[PDB]
């Protein structure tokens, strides 16, 4: 996260760290959506252009964390993966269309002050809140600058951007399964997600029921925090039928 701040304790209790077993390193962010299911970006797990193809036994999920590097004894919980599910139409060849994956945990995780699931949006919450200018919140342990890494989880609030501005900022083909967010050059404030924040959640707090909803997944961008560029996020609601099919069939 570029130009964010340190998270408060328990501020993002759905934030998950995807962790490589060997060598031991951070791979991606992710989010907790129930006691047994974690949501992430498909490119965190499968990206053939970079020879990336992780299997279940390669990875762990770490939940309840604040510090990036420390083993947070008596606070974090570490879970093994039963199965990875990647969207069947994830487009790794072109533009990361449908950049979404689910991971089923081997055993359910106990919730705590530090571990708690985020909601997934219904159609009406998505329609009401996914509007240009409305702000969401991104969190992660990724890079602090394009070109280092934070001591603790970082947070930044960012406005959703009008679709024509998103389209006009890049040569990559945008789809309805994506949205973009960030400040415009004239707006003064700045901030972005970055490498290492991939797969983490873009969340909004509903003013109707005071619950946090995951509207997006950190997906892609060109550089980090560049003027005139925006971060792109997987549109969770647009892909929710697939999420529900997986959880209903395999949960």
């Amino acid at each position: 996260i570029v130009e964010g701040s340190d998270a408060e304790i328990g501020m993002s209790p759905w934030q998950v760290m995807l962790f490589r077993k060997s060598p031991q390193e951070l791979l991606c962010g992710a989010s907790l959506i129930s006691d047994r299911w974690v949501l992430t970006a498909a490119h965190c797990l499968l990206y053939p252009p970079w020879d990336k193809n992780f299997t279940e036994n390669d990875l762990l999920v770490r939940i309840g964390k604040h510090s990036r590097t420390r083993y947070e004894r008596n606070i974090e919980k570490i879970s093994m993966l039963e199965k990875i599910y990647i969207h069947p139409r994830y487009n790794w060849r072109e533009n990361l269309d449908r950049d979404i994956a689910l991971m089923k945990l081997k055993k359910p995780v106990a919730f705590s002050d530090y571990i708690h699931p985020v909601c997934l949006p219904d159609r009406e919450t998505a329609a009401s809140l996914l509007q240009a200018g409305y702000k969401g919140r991104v969190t992660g342990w990724g890079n602090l600058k394009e070109t280092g890494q934070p001591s603790v989880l970082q947070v930044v609030n960012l406005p959703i951007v009008e679709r024509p501005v998103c389209k006009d900022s890049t040569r990559i083909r945008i789809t309805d399964n994506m949205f973009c967010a960030g400040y415009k050059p004239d707006e003064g404030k700045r901030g972005d997600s970055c490498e290492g924040d991939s797969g983490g959640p873009f969340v909004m707090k509903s003013p109707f029921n005071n619950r946090w909803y995951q509207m997006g997944i950190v997906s892609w961008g060109e550089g980090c925090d560049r003027d005139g560029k925006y971060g792109f996020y997987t549109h969770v609601f647009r892909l929710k039928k697939w999420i529900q099919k997986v959880i209903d069939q395999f949960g």
């Binding site: 762990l60 590097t69 083993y71 570490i78």
Partner: peptide, 11 residues
Amino acid sequence: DFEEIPEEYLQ
């Protein structure tokens, strides 16, 4: 740069 995690999670 990461603190080692308990061996039980790697078995």
